[PDB]
Amino acid sequence: LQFVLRFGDFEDVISLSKLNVNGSKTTLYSFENRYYLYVDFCDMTDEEVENQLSIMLEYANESSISIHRLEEYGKLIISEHALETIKKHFAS
Numbered sequence: 529l530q531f532v533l534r535f536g537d538f539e540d541v542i543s544l545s546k547l548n549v550n551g552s553k554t555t556l557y558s559f560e561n562r563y564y565l566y567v568d569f570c571d572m573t574d575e576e577v578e579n580q581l582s583i584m585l586e587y588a589n590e591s592s593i594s595i596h597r598l599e600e601y602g603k604l605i606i607s608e609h610a611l612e613t614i615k616k617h618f619a620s
Contacts, residue, residue: 533588550611
């Protein structure tokens with residue numbers, strides 16, 4: 529299933545990325561001073577997903593902010609492989 533997670537600041541996004549929990553597809557946006565990770569676990573198991581989500585939620589909170597909201601009024605930063613891209617250029 530799909531999730532939009534909100535981060536209070538960029539460092540927490542970088543922190544998450546270092547964890548190698550880049551849960552299949554992730555797209556990253558900014559909006560109103562915060563960062564939003566669109567997170568698609570498309571095909572994973574209800575187990576891999578549970579432990580994955582739960583770490584993501586140490587650095588973020590579940591948001592009701594719609595992906596369409598973000599698409600038209602947010603800045604798209606990275607699509608599809610966001611956490612991997614952030615880890616590569618920002619992590620460590």
